[PDB]
Design a protein around this motif. Structure first.
Motif, mmCIF file in Angstrom:
data_model
loop_
_atom_site.group_PDB
_atom_site.id
_atom_site.type_symbol
_atom_site.label_atom_id
_atom_site.label_comp_id
_atom_site.label_asym_id
_atom_site.label_seq_id
_atom_site.Cartn_x
_atom_site.Cartn_y
_atom_site.Cartn_z
ATOM 1 N N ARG A 68 -3.483 6.698 -48.955
ATOM 2 C CA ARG A 68 -2.622 6.922 -47.800
ATOM 3 C C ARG A 68 -1.230 7.373 -48.225
ATOM 4 O O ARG A 68 -0.615 6.778 -49.111
ATOM 5 C CB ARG A 68 -2.524 5.660 -46.942
ATOM 6 N N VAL A 69 -0.743 8.431 -47.584
ATOM 7 C CA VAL A 69 0.585 8.962 -47.858
ATOM 8 C C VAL A 69 1.645 8.247 -47.025
ATOM 9 O O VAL A 69 1.477 8.056 -45.820
ATOM 10 C CB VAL A 69 0.648 10.476 -47.575
ATOM 11 N N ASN A 70 2.729 7.843 -47.679
ATOM 12 C CA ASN A 70 3.845 7.204 -46.998
ATOM 13 C C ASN A 70 4.753 8.253 -46.368
ATOM 14 O O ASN A 70 5.754 8.660 -46.957
ATOM 15 C CB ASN A 70 4.634 6.325 -47.966
ATOM 16 N N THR A 71 4.386 8.686 -45.166
ATOM 17 C CA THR A 71 5.068 9.779 -44.481
ATOM 18 C C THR A 71 6.554 9.520 -44.228
ATOM 19 O O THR A 71 7.309 10.451 -43.949
ATOM 20 C CB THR A 71 4.393 10.084 -43.132
ATOM 21 N N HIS A 72 6.972 8.263 -44.333
ATOM 22 C CA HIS A 72 8.358 7.905 -44.059
ATOM 23 C C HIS A 72 9.260 8.140 -45.273
ATOM 24 O O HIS A 72 10.470 7.928 -45.208
ATOM 25 C CB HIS A 72 8.447 6.448 -43.598
ATOM 26 N N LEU A 73 8.672 8.597 -46.374
ATOM 27 C CA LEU A 73 9.442 8.884 -47.579
ATOM 28 C C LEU A 73 9.071 10.240 -48.173
ATOM 29 O O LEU A 73 9.896 10.893 -48.815
ATOM 30 C CB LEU A 73 9.238 7.785 -48.622
ATOM 31 N N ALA A 74 7.831 10.662 -47.950
ATOM 32 C CA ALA A 74 7.371 11.957 -48.432
ATOM 33 C C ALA A 74 6.255 12.507 -47.551
ATOM 34 O O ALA A 74 5.469 11.747 -46.986
ATOM 35 C CB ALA A 74 6.903 11.849 -49.871
ATOM 36 N N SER A 75 6.189 13.830 -47.443
ATOM 37 C CA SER A 75 5.173 14.485 -46.627
ATOM 38 C C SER A 75 3.833 14.537 -47.348
ATOM 39 O O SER A 75 3.766 14.365 -48.566
ATOM 40 C CB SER A 75 5.612 15.899 -46.252
ATOM 41 N N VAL A 76 2.772 14.791 -46.590
ATOM 42 C CA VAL A 76 1.424 14.846 -47.140
ATOM 43 C C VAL A 76 1.281 15.988 -48.142
ATOM 44 O O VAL A 76 0.612 15.847 -49.163
ATOM 45 C CB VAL A 76 0.377 15.005 -46.020
ATOM 46 N N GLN A 77 1.935 17.109 -47.858
ATOM 47 C CA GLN A 77 1.867 18.286 -48.716
ATOM 48 C C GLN A 77 2.495 18.015 -50.085
ATOM 49 O O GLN A 77 1.886 18.271 -51.135
ATOM 50 C CB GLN A 77 2.564 19.465 -48.031
ATOM 51 N N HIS A 78 3.705 17.466 -50.054
ATOM 52 C CA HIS A 78 4.466 17.145 -51.256
ATOM 53 C C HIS A 78 3.693 16.183 -52.152
ATOM 54 O O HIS A 78 3.477 16.447 -53.343
ATOM 55 C CB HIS A 78 5.817 16.544 -50.866
ATOM 56 N N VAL A 79 3.282 15.068 -51.558
ATOM 57 C CA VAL A 79 2.486 14.059 -52.241
ATOM 58 C C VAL A 79 1.189 14.648 -52.794
ATOM 59 O O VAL A 79 0.755 14.288 -53.886
ATOM 60 C CB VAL A 79 2.164 12.884 -51.293
ATOM 61 N N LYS A 80 0.581 15.560 -52.042
ATOM 62 C CA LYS A 80 -0.656 16.200 -52.477
ATOM 63 C C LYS A 80 -0.432 17.009 -53.747
ATOM 64 O O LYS A 80 -1.237 16.948 -54.676
ATOM 65 C CB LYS A 80 -1.223 17.099 -51.378
ATOM 66 N N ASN A 81 0.661 17.765 -53.786
ATOM 67 C CA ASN A 81 0.979 18.547 -54.977
ATOM 68 C C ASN A 81 1.310 17.664 -56.182
ATOM 69 O O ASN A 81 0.845 17.917 -57.303
ATOM 70 C CB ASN A 81 2.137 19.503 -54.690
ATOM 71 N N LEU A 82 2.103 16.624 -55.946
ATOM 72 C CA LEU A 82 2.447 15.680 -57.007
ATOM 73 C C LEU A 82 1.192 15.021 -57.574
ATOM 74 O O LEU A 82 1.076 14.814 -58.784
ATOM 75 C CB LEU A 82 3.416 14.617 -56.491
ATOM 76 N N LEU A 83 0.256 14.693 -56.689
ATOM 77 C CA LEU A 83 -1.012 14.105 -57.099
ATOM 78 C C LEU A 83 -1.883 15.126 -57.812
ATOM 79 O O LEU A 83 -2.718 14.763 -58.631
ATOM 80 C CB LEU A 83 -1.767 13.538 -55.897
ATOM 81 N N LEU A 84 -1.698 16.402 -57.491
ATOM 82 C CA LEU A 84 -2.400 17.461 -58.202
ATOM 83 C C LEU A 84 -1.925 17.497 -59.649
ATOM 84 O O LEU A 84 -2.735 17.564 -60.580
ATOM 85 C CB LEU A 84 -2.183 18.816 -57.526
ATOM 86 N N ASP A 85 -0.608 17.434 -59.834
ATOM 87 C CA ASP A 85 -0.036 17.371 -61.177
ATOM 88 C C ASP A 85 -0.517 16.125 -61.926
ATOM 89 O O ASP A 85 -0.915 16.199 -63.096
ATOM 90 C CB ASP A 85 1.493 17.388 -61.109
ATOM 91 N N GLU A 86 -0.487 14.986 -61.238
ATOM 92 C CA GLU A 86 -0.933 13.719 -61.808
ATOM 93 C C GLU A 86 -2.389 13.768 -62.270
ATOM 94 O O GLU A 86 -2.710 13.336 -63.376
ATOM 95 C CB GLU A 86 -0.751 12.589 -60.795
ATOM 96 N N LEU A 87 -3.266 14.278 -61.412
ATOM 97 C CA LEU A 87 -4.678 14.412 -61.753
ATOM 98 C C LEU A 87 -4.877 15.395 -62.898
ATOM 99 O O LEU A 87 -5.773 15.221 -63.724
ATOM 100 C CB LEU A 87 -5.496 14.858 -60.538
ATOM 101 N N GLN A 88 -4.039 16.426 -62.944
ATOM 102 C CA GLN A 88 -4.061 17.363 -64.060
ATOM 103 C C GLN A 88 -3.767 16.628 -65.364
ATOM 104 O O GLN A 88 -4.413 16.869 -66.384
ATOM 105 C CB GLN A 88 -3.058 18.499 -63.845
ATOM 106 N N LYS A 89 -2.791 15.724 -65.322
ATOM 107 C CA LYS A 89 -2.424 14.942 -66.500
ATOM 108 C C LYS A 89 -3.515 13.954 -66.925
ATOM 109 O O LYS A 89 -3.937 13.950 -68.081
ATOM 110 C CB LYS A 89 -1.117 14.186 -66.248
ATOM 111 N N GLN A 90 -3.961 13.121 -65.988
ATOM 112 C CA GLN A 90 -4.926 12.061 -66.286
ATOM 113 C C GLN A 90 -6.270 12.591 -66.777
ATOM 114 O O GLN A 90 -6.798 12.126 -67.789
ATOM 115 C CB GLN A 90 -5.155 11.184 -65.052
ATOM 116 N N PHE A 91 -6.820 13.564 -66.060
ATOM 117 C CA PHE A 91 -8.156 14.070 -66.358
ATOM 118 C C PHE A 91 -8.140 15.175 -67.410
ATOM 119 O O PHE A 91 -9.131 15.886 -67.587
ATOM 120 C CB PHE A 91 -8.822 14.580 -65.080
ATOM 121 N N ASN A 92 -7.011 15.306 -68.104
ATOM 122 C CA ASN A 92 -6.857 16.258 -69.203
ATOM 123 C C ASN A 92 -7.261 17.694 -68.874
ATOM 124 O O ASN A 92 -7.786 18.409 -69.728
ATOM 125 C CB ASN A 92 -7.647 15.774 -70.420
#
Length: 461
Positions: free
Chosen positions: A55-79
């Motif tokens: 769940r995205v905390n819309t009161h601090l960040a938008s779904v799009q922003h969080v989605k991209n950040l999580l894209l970067d994160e998944l890029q890092k974790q899953f090598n």
RNA sequence: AGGGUAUAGCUCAGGGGUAGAGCAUUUGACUAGAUCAAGAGGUCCCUGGUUCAAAUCCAGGUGCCCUCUCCA
């Protein structure tokens, strides 16, 4: 697929069987069908949901922003792997990541470690093994050793043990960051990383310290509940059982933090966890109290609880339950008395809720169990004892309709939301399966292959 | 018509009559420990009831807990 059925006491399994094989279901489907339905359910409960839902905390960040950040994160974790992050069309603030597994080609190492059942379930959902979770380990284990993690599903392993003949379940392999000495010598209540999972049976992202103010790991129906409750900005909302405050902070975020959200709980530390979550996610409309929900109605003569009757705009009863709907749940060593021990408490909390509810107000009752006695039966009981209450349709509608047995009508059952783990076959997600997957199939998968859950909506007259 | 639980430092069995295991700790050997031995340990939560006798069975009291994704 890979795991057996959920290990239940004979009495318990026969109890649930009595539940799913009642006169009504037998009539509408036949024993030969209902039985296979039940067995399929028991077979699915041992396996993790095929989707990591955040769940995205819309009161601090938008779904799009969080989605991209999580894209970067998944890029890092899953090598550098390529797993998608879908956005739910009905649940606007929910992201979906598919789970890669199971992997049956994992070579078991000789250096072993054993975690608690709970920690095991967490690992299957993409968590690492942190120090407080390890209850047993090879005596020759050093930090850096490629070890094999097993889950003590029965919870019969005594801490510190160097051997275990009981029931183990292979969770995958990981590199150790502690020796057995460091863990079990002396009594350091140490925290941190114990086993970094490098080859799990089910591959899912680790959500430990990633975007703590933007994310909240939460099962799809649990996120759905706050949407169904549909809180408006400026209203007064109360959830009797709130801890650790997932649905609470969600409610607060839906109201744009404009209004009043009172959260109660019986255990102190849990309430502190509520407050910590609220402060973390930036919600200021949340006020948490350590208090017995059953005794929340004001009686004697004297802002804190208890509260005057009919003083809340909306009330969420996320009632305590058996937790039979939990996935993955490989074994449950509970007594039948223990499993059915919730109905009275649920009813007390329900009564207290109805008393505290304003007219034309909304009461959402929700459990994460599959039993009739705690779900549909409670709905019938509620509709009987309280004639002011009336069953309402829900939005969004995602889960299945109510299960026959409580004596409700088809029109009544259609207004309930019951999530059934045995709805669809267990998807063995592979990269090749990923590439060749239609999006609507993934969405239907996320909507159907989920934990056990039950949601009912009420309005007061 | 809420339930479970309280026993050694930790994790937990057991059971109407002399207190049990694993781990930790302690000591001794053998080359700090993937070795071998040896013992150190507890008013069995409080109170009351049944009983010849309660750590055990019963009631009340109290503490902890009953996962709704990740320091378990």
């Amino acid at each position: 697929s890979i795991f057996p059925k959920i290990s239940l006491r004979p009495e318990v399994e026969n109890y649930l069987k009595e539940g799913f094989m009642n006169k009504e279901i037998v009539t509408a489907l036949g024993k030969q069908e209902a039985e296979r339905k039940f067995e399929t359910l028991l077979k699915h409960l041992s396996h993790p949901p095929s989707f990591t839902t955040v769940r995205v905390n819309t009161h601090l960040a938008s779904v799009q922003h969080v989605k991209n950040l999580l894209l970067d994160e998944l890029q890092k974790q899953f090598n550098g792997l390529s797993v998608p992050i879908l956005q739910h069309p009905d649940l606007q603030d929910v992201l979906l990541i598919p789970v890669i597994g199971p992997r049956k080609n994992i070579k078991k190492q000789q250096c072993e470690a054993i975690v608690g059942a709970q920690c095991g379930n967490a690992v299957l959902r993409g968590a690492h093994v942190y120090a407080p979770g390890i209850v047993s380990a090879s005596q020759f284990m050093k930090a850096g050793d490629v070890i094999s993690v097993y889950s003590d599903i029965k919870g019969k392993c005594k801490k510190g043990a160097k051997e275990f003949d009981g029931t183990k379940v292979f969770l995958g392999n990981g590199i150790s960051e502690l020796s057995r000495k460091e863990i079990f010598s002396g009594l350091p209540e140490l925290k941190g990383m114990g086993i970094r999972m490098t080859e799990p049976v089910y591959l899912s992202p680790s959500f430990d310290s990633v975007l703590p103010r933007y994310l909240f790991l939460q099962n799809l129906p649990s996120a759905l509940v706050s949407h169904v409750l549909n809180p408006q900005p400026g209203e007064k909302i109360l959830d009797l059982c709130a801890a650790p405050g997932g649905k609470t902070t969600h409610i607060a975020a839906l109201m744009h933090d404009q209004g009043e959200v009172i959260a109660l709980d019986k255990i102190f530390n849990k309430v502190e966890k509520i407050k910590q979550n609220a402060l973390l996610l930036g919600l200021n409309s949340i006020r948490a109290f350590c208090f017995d929900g059953t005794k929340a109605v004001k009686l004697d003569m004297v802002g804190e609880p208890p509260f005057l009757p009919e003083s809340f705009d909306r009330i969420l009863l996320d009632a305590p339950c058996s937790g039979m709907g939990q996935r993955p749940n490989m074994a449950c060593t509970w007594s039948v008395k223990e499993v059915a021990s919730y109905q009275p408490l649920q009813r007390k909390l329900f009564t207290a809720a109805v008393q505290l509810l304003k007219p034309e107000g909304v009461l959402v009752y929700s459990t994460c169990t599959i039993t009739l006695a705690e779900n549909e039966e409670q709905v019938a009981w509620a509709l009987t004892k309280f004639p002011c209450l009336q069953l309402q349709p829900q939005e969004p509608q995602i889960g299945g309709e109510g299960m026959r047995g409580a004596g409700l009508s088809c029109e009544q059952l259609k207004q309930l939301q019951r999530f059934d783990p045995s709805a669809v076959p267990l998807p063995d997600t592979d990269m090749d399966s990923l590439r060749e997957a239609r999006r609507e199939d993934m969405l239907r998968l996320a909507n159907k292959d989920s934990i056990g859950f039950f949601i009912a909506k009420f309005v007061k007259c």
